[PDB]
Amino acid sequence: SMSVSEIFVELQGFLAAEQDIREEIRKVVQSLEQTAREILTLLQGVHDIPKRCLKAREHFGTVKTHLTSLKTKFPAEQYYRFHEHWRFVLQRLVFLAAFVVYLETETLVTREAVTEILGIEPDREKGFHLDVEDYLSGVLILASELSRLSVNSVTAGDYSRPLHISTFINELDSGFRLLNLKNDSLRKRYDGLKYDVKKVEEVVYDLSIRGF
Amino acid sequence: SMSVSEIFVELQGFLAAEQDIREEIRKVVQSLEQTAREILTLLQGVHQGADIPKRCLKAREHFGTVKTHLTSLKTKFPAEQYYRFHEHWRFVLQRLVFLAAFVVYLETETLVTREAVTEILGIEPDREKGFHLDVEDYLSGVLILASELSRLSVNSVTAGDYSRPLHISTFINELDSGFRLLNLKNDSLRKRYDGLKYDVKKVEEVVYDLSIRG
Amino acid sequence: MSVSEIFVELQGFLAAEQDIREEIRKVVQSLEQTAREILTLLQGVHQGDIPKRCLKAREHFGTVKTHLTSLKTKFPAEQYYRFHEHWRFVLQRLVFLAAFVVYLETETLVTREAVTEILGIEPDREKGFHLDVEDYLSGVLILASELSRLSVNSVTAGDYSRPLHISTFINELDSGFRLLNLKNDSLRKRYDGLKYDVKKVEEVVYDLSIRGF
Amino acid sequence: SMSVSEIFVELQGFLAAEQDIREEIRKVVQSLEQTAREILTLLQGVHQDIPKRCLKAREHFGTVKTHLTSLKTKFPAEQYYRFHEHWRFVLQRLVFLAAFVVYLETETLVTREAVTEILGIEPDREKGFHLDVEDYLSGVLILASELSRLSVNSVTAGDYSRPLHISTFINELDSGFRLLNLKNDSLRKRYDGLKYDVKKVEEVVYDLSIRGF
Amino acid sequence: MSVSEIFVELQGFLAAEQDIREEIRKVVQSLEQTAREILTLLQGVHQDIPKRCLKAREHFGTVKTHLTSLKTKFPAEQYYRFHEHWRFVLQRLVFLAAFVVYLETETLVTREAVTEILGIEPDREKGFHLDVEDYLSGVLILASELSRLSVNSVTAGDYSRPLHISTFINELDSGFRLLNLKNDSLRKRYDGLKYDVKKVEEVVYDLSIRGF
Amino acid sequence: MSVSEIFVELQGFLAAEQDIREEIRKVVQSLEQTAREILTLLQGVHQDIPKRCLKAREHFGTVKTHLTSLKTKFPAEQYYRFHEHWRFVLQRLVFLAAFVVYLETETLVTREAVTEILGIEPDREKGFHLDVEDYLSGVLILASELSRLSVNSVTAGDYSRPLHISTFINELDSGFRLLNLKNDSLRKRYDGLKYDVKKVEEVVYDLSIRGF
Amino acid sequence: MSVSEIFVELQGFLAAEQDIREEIRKVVQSLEQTAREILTLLQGVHDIPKRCLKAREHFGTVKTHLTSLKTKFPAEQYYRFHEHWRFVLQRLVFLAAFVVYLETETLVTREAVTEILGIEPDREKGFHLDVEDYLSGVLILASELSRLSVNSVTAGDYSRPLHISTFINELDSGFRLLNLKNDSLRKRYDGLKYDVKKVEEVVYDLSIRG
Amino acid sequence: GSMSVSEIFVELQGFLAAEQDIREEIRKVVQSLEQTAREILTLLQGVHQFQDIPKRCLKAREHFGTVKTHLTSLKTKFPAEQYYRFHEHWRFVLQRLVFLAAFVVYLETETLVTREAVTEILGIEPDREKGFHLDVEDYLSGVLILASELSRLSVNSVTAGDYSRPLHISTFINELDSGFRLLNLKNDSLRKRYDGLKYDVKKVEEVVYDLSIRGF
């Protein structure tokens, strides 16, 4: 036997506590997004590479700290309750992590490797996980970056990179065809990959026909 | 060092598994939504020449069928991942809070407490883990109640009951004061709270029409 | 076969199909006209002799029967669903109008099969031109909106009893729709409209009861 | 009269029945779309042995035949056009992929009927699962865009002869469509895309000629 | 002719056409001002009407003037070449003409009567016509004004006018149903009429259930 | 007259007009087909030219018949009320005629010469005219066709034609510069001409740098 | 001059210009804040002479800020940097007009608005109040008054709406005189008819009650 | 005194009509300008077909005589202090003129006309003078238009057999690109148009490349 007023003062209790957790998260995500912009401007200078990748990995130190700081703000089991607060930045980081590995190794960073770069735990560890959907978004962002690098690369006199970028992006595309995407955001962004494919293939054509 | 091909075949396995989980969820949500429609049609007979305690007993028997579906639903996804698949049952869970609050109102002229809703549904309270009742989902159901009550207030007078509207008016005015205390943030919830003022207005106006008559 | 030859063949097939559609359009124009006439006729009820109008109405449905048997001659009966979209709008109007006449006469919901009979169509067990479930339901929702209007207009004209019957009727339709688990989007959209018709009609009755009638 | 309640209870049975039909179709279409995705990755490897890809490809068309026979069981044959939209997309991809194999084999445009045989479907004069003309032409339009892309990649791989064949073939396709008097909007839309494919392949050819090939 | 000579010629024709259009514009500004004046004057009824209708009919003297002036600006047989310049104001004037007639007579001005008020010719006479489509638009705009008037009428204590307006508007609605509109703008504007019909019948309802 | 009566009259006028429109469609259908055929015929040149040019001109016999036929379908003085029904096909026909004339004589068909080939009248004879905006539209279409031809010409090994097409197109560009364009569809299409100019200029560059 | 010299000079000027713009924004932030404060406290009407007084005290803060704003850029270049303060200046016109309406049930004249804001008339040079900015303020006013009309009712004041009706119908009659040409302004003018309709309908509701 | 709504609005109508008249007067002047501008353009663009340039450069400077008269004419139409209120009316043509001025100077001296020199060619005043100024944003727009015209020229120059011009145009455009790199552009029209420069840089360097691989 609780009156409606008692019921609502109780609820106000819970809501204020939940609201506080969300505010605490927002602040850390501010810091995360700034470090993330910093990592981006840095890597987008490639448009001395090993130097940028070294500088960028120093910056993932700062990400590791923020991420451990983030886990402190909310209860581990409620990851998906507050997920949308950091969905954007976390996808950028996957992007930037993959981008670094691509510039170092011409290879696609494995999902587990991305967790390790960021701090963060794999699926079989509980506590802050990396979503399959967030990883794939980061990879599609990568592809758009790479198609852009391909054109700037011919600009700067590098005529070998675009051919590697071409084969790589065609790999990603075959990759996605294996998936039967259902998420709308994700099928949307996948639709953009076909334009990146087209652009990069056309860059290599331009190079093959030249000199002749 | 996995090739990109190898990476993707792996993800496909994961994605396929999750998608089957979501398809299994949907089918139980169909069933839940049906039972809920059936509990609605049943209680909404109160809007005609209104036997109420009869309606309230047949309704509570159907909550048996709800308890059963919810037990079945828990079967379809891992308990800890409630918030991953929550959106699939957000709608019907809210309807079920509404329906439960509606039954409790008709019996007792009172607002069912959150915990009592969980009991009616065969769901757990917060300190028990496994399938929870969100605060936001509880509140949404209450707002849908308000709208159903304002309608009832009108149909009440038509059916010759001129006392009920008075009761519904103070009830609604208490819920309004209730939300006042809350400093709402969720956008879907603040949107729907904006609707409660119209219900408040409609009910007060019913009461005015009554006081003016004679 | 060369590509050229393949395409001269196709042009043959599309030309034929385009002729069927054009033949369909013309008859649907006549149908739509007849439907508009039945509508202006019935809609007189909004000023306050109704059976007069249902009677004039029914005659026009003689014209409807003609146009429909003429429609059946324009396309092969088994391809009903390939050309359905041409008459979707007018068939839904006609269901509305038919239901509207029956309501005015008997205060009841015309059965799907009685609509078929009134329009000179065949039921489901008879093959050749059928009345979709989805088209029937659309016409019923159109009726609900027309009746909520009438309920208002009825009070203006001094009839204080009709609105009470319209309220129970519409509340019955609402309870009917609840049973269905709608999937078609157009139809779910339209169903969302019904709750406003319900509200309007319930409020008319309130206005009457609170002033004693 | 049948009361509104009774009418609606009846309808609910019909709607549930139709909804099961559609859900049975969706499942088949998933498998179908998968098989088609596999066929596609398989043939898209040419963008970097051809007869080998064409053999493995037609083995998968086995899987396709079994899925479409499986599909005809899910709905009543005479109702093709009512549930057509469920498989529109994948049927068009299948035309494309069929056509694509035939091009790689014989440098020619698969006939519509040939596409029928390959899929284990019936031609127009047999009753049951048909291949629309409109879906056929969509598949061929899809083919043209694949070929224009192939023409480009063909050059980078060092094949300077294939682009010239693709050029005349695409020009034949463009000639063909000009014969048709297209009326369907989706189709007219996709036809507008062909002129870009034509332009691209004629420009590949130009790039090769001024460099003497 | 070389292409040069061809083009200098065409520039001549275009400049000519350009000037005809500009002359049309200046008159149409005058027309639109006179129309605005007639509107403010008539729109006083929302707060003596045989006075308003008089001062209004004097102004249609100024309208006749501008229209005869409009005839001199272009070749009469090319009406539809430059019709779009005055389409707006011609429909306003139809509306204003119909509005005056309604406040005097409670009736719908015929199209031939509107032509007379404006100093325009009827279809059987050649030179400046009044389109069927333009007439119907004016009538649609009239319906909206009358639905507003119905509401203000109640506020000012006149409980009879709304009854007449409701009958009128229902007659117009009956009228349009007979038409098989094809023009998009016109079908579009016809869709508006159902809201006016609704509003007006509801005003009357409000009156009936309170007894008037 | 009652409103009822008024509208029953207007439906009559609307019906007669809709009918005129329907009759125009049907002949425009035929016209559009004949126009497609002349095109398929002429576009063979992208792989015996005076053969095609002749075969074309006999097809303009069948357009002459379709245009005299169209003049049957509406009252001559109302040309601009029904203009939008043949705007497309009229412009294609301008194009096709100019195209023919260009292949014969490497020159721009004068506007009056286009009127003659179509069996229509000049501006000084009344009855079915050729709009200046329609002719310019045809000419701009021609320019696009010619830039394509310039490319295909090289492919078929003709290394003189592009130089002719290049000065031709440059003359057209100098001509539109004289006009002060106002209609938007035409100024829109004029913006396309710069690309054709660029295309053909670069074809010639290609040729010059490899010596022809 | 070589091209690099020319461009290093241009850099000079753009930087200077960019500093002027940045100095402006910081003043406009302050301005927009004090404006929100004048609004939140006036919309409290949803005791009036007290509110109108506290409101006029806050315009003190506005005068100082606009004086401060004039120091950030050369006066003759008013229209170069006008778009930075277009929004807030129109809000202030609205708020000024709103105050004057609550006080006097009348339409603040343009020159009275300059006086309230500590701005100069057209015939003085240095910081002016645009005719289009004034008209936008007045259109904002009409929308606020239509909301006020509805809330006035819920608070039991059944005479105010009738005043608001007459007022807004006056405005409408005024705009009808204007031959607007600016698109933004014509766009907002189209909004006025809805406010007119709303207010006339509130009065309707009152006359038929009950 | 104190005014009714009606009185307020009648006054405002006076001001609006007056401003609209100012705008209408500006347009008529701008038409003239735009025509003179087209003529200057058709005259210079003759270079795309070369041996005769200093003649074109003179006739062109003759026409700038007509431009100066129109602009002195334009300044009468509106109050000098209100430049930015009516600026958008002549933005387009003023940028054209910047281009056409910069173009003649390039053909004469192979140099980038200084901003003040263009003001002198148009009969306008420099920044320290008050009355009709040349915006820095408009100047740069004209320079960008120049770049695209020079890239076009580069290509046609090769066709006409002049293989030394393209190498001059190359270093020039590359100097332009280096210039903009120094500016921190903020205006969106300008940053959009800058984005086009990279295409003219690309095309002119490609021309240079084609030349070198054939020994020139």
F122: distance to nearest CA of chain H, Å? 30
Closest-CA residue of A relative to D33 is: A180
Q: At what angle do helices F3-42 and D162-179 cross, to 10 degrees?
A: 150
DSSP summary character for residue F124: G
Using the 3D structure, point to which of C128, C147, C179 is the last residue of a domain: C128
Residue G66's identity, in one-letter code, is: L
Q: Which of D112, D115, D122, D113 is nearest to D98 (CA)?
A: D115
Nearest C-alpha of chain F: how many angstroms from D176?
9
Contact C171 B40 (CB under 8 A): no
The whole-angstrom separation of Cα B61 and Cα B59 is 5
The residues, any chain, with a CB within 8 Å of residue H117's CB and separated by 6 or more, are H101, H105
Q: Which helix or strand (DSSP H or E) is residue A3 part of? A: none
In a shared domain, residues G98 and G163: no
Q: Which two tokens stand for residue D46?
A: 């040419």
- Regarding whether B98 and B173 lie in a shared domain, the answer is no
The answer on A138 and A165 residing in a single domain is: yes
CB contact under 8 A, D205 and F154: no
Q: Which residues of D touch F (CB under 8 A)?
A: 168, 171, 175, 178-179, 181, 199, 202-203, 205-206, 209-210
Interatomic CA distance for residues G115 and C80, integer angstroms: 76
Q: How many C-beta neighbours within 10 Å does residue F125 have?
A: 10
CB < 8 Å to A155, chain H: 198, 202
CATH of the domain at G109: 1.20.58.190
3-class DSSP assignment, residue G94 = helix
The answer to whether the CB of B150 falls within 8 A of the CB of B195 is no
Residue F114 shares a structural domain with residue F210: no
Contact G169 E47 (CB under 8 A): yes
In sequence order, what DSSP letters do the residues of H6-62 get, joined into one string?
HHHHHHHHHHHHHHHHHHHHHHHHHHHHHHHHHHHHHHHGGGG--TTHHHHHHHHHH
Q: Is the dihedral of CA E22, E27, E33, E39 positive or negative?
A: negative
Closest Cα to residue F168, out of F190, F187, F142, F191? F142
Q: Which residues of A13-47 are buried (b: 16+ CB within 10 A; e: fewer)?
A: eebeebeebeebbeebbebbbebbebbbebbeebe
**What does the alpha-carbon distance between residue A210 and residue A193 come to, in Å, rounded to a whole number?**
26
Contact residues of F toward H, CB < 8 A: 167, 170, 174, 177-178, 180, 198, 201-202, 204-205, 208-209
Of F134, F48, F151, which is closest to residue F96 (Cα–Cα)? F134
Of E95, E89, E92, give the one whose Cα is nearest residue E28.
Answer: E89
Q: Is B24 helix (H, G, I), strand (E, B) or coil?
A: helix
Q: Hey, which chains touch D, using 3+ CB pairs under 8 Å?
A: A, C, F
**Would the CA dihedral through A178, A183, A188, A193 be positive or negative?**
negative
**Of the candidates A5, A111, A175, which has its C-beta nearest B178's C-beta?**
A5
Residue D14: half-sphere exposure toward Cβ, Cα within 13 Å = 13
Task: State the number of CA atoms in the 13 A half-sphere of E74 facing the CB.
Answer: 26
Residue carrying the six token digits 């820095």: H136
Look up tokens 């420009």; give the residue.
Answer: D203
Q: What angle do CA A30, A183, B185 make, to 5 degrees?
A: 40
Token pair, residue D57, equals 């490809």
Helices and strands of chain G, counted as H and E runs: 7, 0
Contact between residue D117 and residue D13 where contact means Cβ atoms under 8 Å apart: no
Q: How far is CA A49 from the centre of its chain?
A: 20
- Quote the number of domains for chain D: 2
CA distance G191 to F109: 53
CA–CA gap between residue A84 and residue A95 (Å, rounded): 17
Of the candidates H70, H193, H187, the residue with the CA atom closest to the CA atom of residue H132? H70
Contact: F204, H49; criterion CB under 8 Å: no
For residue B163, count other CB atoms closer than 10 A to its CB. Answer: 8
Q: How far apart are CA G59 and CA G57, in angstroms?
A: 5
Q: Is the dihedral of CA E93, E96, E102, E105 positive or negative?
A: negative
Task: Determine the residue type at B35.
Answer: T
**Would you say C125 and C131 are in contact if contact means Cβ atoms under 8 Å apart?**
no
Write out chain F residues lying below 8 Å of E172, CB-based.
Answer: 3
Copy the structure tokens of residue B51.
């036997």
Partner chains of A (3+ C-beta pairs under 8 Å) = B, D, H
Measured CA to CA, the distance from residue E177 to residue E190 in angstroms comes to: 10
What is the Cα Rg of chain F in Å?
21
Whether residues F121 and F154 share a domain: the answer is: no
Option in A170, A177, A204 nearest D37 (CB): A177
| Shortest CA distance from F11: residue in chain E | E179
DSSP string of A8-59, one letter each residue: HHHHHHHHHHHHHHHHHHHHHHHHHHHHHHHHHHHHGGG--HHHHHHHHHHH
What are φ and ψ of residue B81, in 5° steps?
-95, 30
Which residues on chain F are in Cβ contact (under 8 Å) with D203? Answer: 151
Residues in B closer than 8 angstroms to C181, CB to CB, are 30, 33-34, 37
- Cβ contacts of C36 within 8 Å, gap of 6 or more: E177, E178, E180
CB E176 within 8 A of CB E193: yes
Q: Rounded to whole angstroms, how far apart are CA atoms E164 and E150?
A: 9
Check whether residue D107 and residue D14 sit in a common domain.
Answer: yes
| Gyration radius (Cα) of chain B, Å | 21
The count of CB pairs under 8 A between chains A and H is 3
Between CA E103 and CA E105 the distance in angstroms is 6
User: Which amino acid belongs to residue F138?
Assistant: G
Specify whether D68 is located in the same domain as D151. no
- In one-letter notation, the amino acid at residue E82 is F
Verify that F208 and F120 share a domain, yes or no. no
Asked if the Cβ–Cβ distance from G179 to H20 is below 8 Å, we say yes
CB G5 within 8 A of CB H175: no
Contacts of H83 in chain G (CB under 8 A): 79-80
For testing contact with chain C, the best of D2, D6, D8 (most C CBs within 10 A): D8
Contacts (Cβ under 8 Å, ≥6 apart) of A154 = A162, A203, A206, A207
Q: Do E180 and C36 touch (CB under 8 A)?
A: yes
Are G14 and H114 an interchain contact pair (Cβ–Cβ within 8 Å)? no
CA distance G42 to A166: 63
Q: Which of A127, A149, A179 lies at the terminal end of a domain, its last residue? A: A127
Q: Which of C178, C202, C203 is the closest to B41 by Cβ?
A: C178
Give the range of the structural domain holding residue H209, as residue numbers without chain letter. 132-216
CB under 8 A, 24+ apart: contacts of H80-83 = H80/H130, H80/H131, H80/H132, H81/G76, H81/G78, H81/G125, H82/G79, H83/G79, H83/G80, H83/H132, H83/H133
Q: CA angle A191-A196-A199, nearest 5°?
A: 135
3-state per-residue secondary structure call for B70-135:
HHHHHCCCCHHHHHHHHHHCHHHHHHHHHHHHHHHHHHHCCCCCHHHHHHHHCCCCHHHCCCCCCH
Contacts of A174 in chain D (CB under 8 A): 41, 44
**Residue G167: C-alpha distances to residues F119, F189, G173, H162 (Å):** 66, 50, 10, 76
Comparing C-alpha atoms, which of G99, G97, G109, G91 is closest to residue G33? G91
- From residue H51, alpha-carbon distances to D114, H56, H107, H141, H211 in Å are 64, 10, 12, 29, 21
Give the number of other CB atoms < 10 A from CB of residue H147. Answer: 26
Locate tokens 């590949």: which residue? Answer: D204
- Find the length of chain A: 212
Q: What number of C-beta contacts closer than 8 Å exist between E and G?
A: 34
Written as six digits, the tokens of F155 are 């492919």
Number of Cα atoms under 13 Å in the Cβ half of residue D38: 16
Give the residue before each break in chain H, using a C-to-N cut-off of over 2.5 angstroms; say none if it is continuous: 49
Residue G208 identity (one-letter amino acid): I
Residues from chain C contacting residue E180 (CB–CB below 8 Å): 29, 32-33, 36
Question: Nearest residue of D to residue F208 by CA position?
Answer: D210
CB contact (8 A) between residue E151 and residue G204: yes
> Under a CB-based contact definition with an 8 Å cutoff, are residues C94 and C139 in contact?
yes
Resolution (A): 3.0
> In this structure, are F77 and F147 located in the same domain?
no
Q: Which two tokens stand for residue A111?
A: 């999902």
Q: Please, which residues have CB within 8 angstroms of residue H204's CB and are 6 or more apart in sequence?
A: H150, H151, H154, H166, H169, H170, H173
User: Do G83 and G6 share a domain, yes or no?
Assistant: yes
Given the structure tokens 């009893």, which residue do they identify?
A: C161
Distance CA D145, CA D170 (A): 9
Tokens of H168: 């001059």
Chosen domain end from E93, E127, E161: E127
Rg (CA), chain E: 21
Phi, psi of A73 (to 5 degrees): -75, -20
Rg of chain C over Cα atoms, rounded to whole angstroms, equals: 21
Closest residue in chain G to residue H174, using alpha carbons only? G3
Say which residue the tokens 């709750």 belong to: C195
B124: left (phi over 0), alpha (psi -120 to 50) or beta: beta
The tally of CA atoms less than 13 A away on the side-chain side of residue B2 is 14
Which residue in E18, E133, E13, E126 sits closest to E82, CA to CA?
E18
Beta strands in G72-119 (DSSP E): none
Q: C-alpha dihedral over B21, B27, B30, B36, to 10 degrees?
A: -80
Give the dihedral of Cα atoms B166, B168, B171, B172; nearest 10 deg: -110
Question: Structure tokens of D27?
Answer: 């499942």
- The two structure tokens encoding residue F150: 């310039």
Question: Among all chains, which residue has been given the structure tokens 């080998």?
Answer: D52
Whole-angstrom Cα distance, residue G158 to residue G164?
A: 11
CB contact under 8 A, E180 and C152: no
B22: DSSP letter: H
Helices (H) and strands (E) in chain A, counts: 8, 0
Angle (CA) B112-B115-B116 rounded to 5° is: 45
Write the single-letter amino acid at C137: L
- CA D76 from chain center: how many Å? 23
> Does H213 sit within 8 Å of A155, measured CB to CB?
no
Rounded to 5°, the CA angle B28-B32-B33 comes to 115
Q: List the one residue out of H166, H176, H177, H178 whose CA is nearest residue H206.
A: H166
Chain E residues with CB under 8 Å of a chain F CB are 1-4, 6-8, 10-11, 13-15, 17-18, 77-81, 107-108, 110-111, 132, 135-136, 168, 171-172, 174-176, 178-182
Q: Quick check: F144 and F196 in contact, CB under 8 A?
A: yes
The verdict on C166 and C209 lying in the same domain is yes
Chains within contact range of chain H (3+ C-beta pairs < 8 Å): A, F, G
Q: Which residues of B touch C168 (CB under 8 A)?
A: 48
Tokens linked to H205: 């360097």
Which chains border F (3 or more CB–CB pairs < 8 Å)?
D, E, H
CB count within 10 Å of CB D60 equals: 18
**D175 → closest Cβ in F40, F154, F206:** F40
3-state secondary structure of H130: coil
Residue in B closest to C208 by C-alpha = B158
Do residue C91 and residue C163 come from a single domain?
no
| Backbone region of residue G125 per phi and psi (left: phi > 0; alpha: psi in -120 to 50; beta: other values) | left
Answer whether the bond into residue A157 is a cis peptide, omega within 30°. Answer: no
The minimum CA-CA distance between G109 and chain E, rounded to whole Å, is: 22
CATH number reported for the structural domain that contains residue H150 in this entry? 1.20.58.200
The Cα F29–Cα E114 span in angstroms is: 39
C180 φ, ψ to 5°? -70, 150
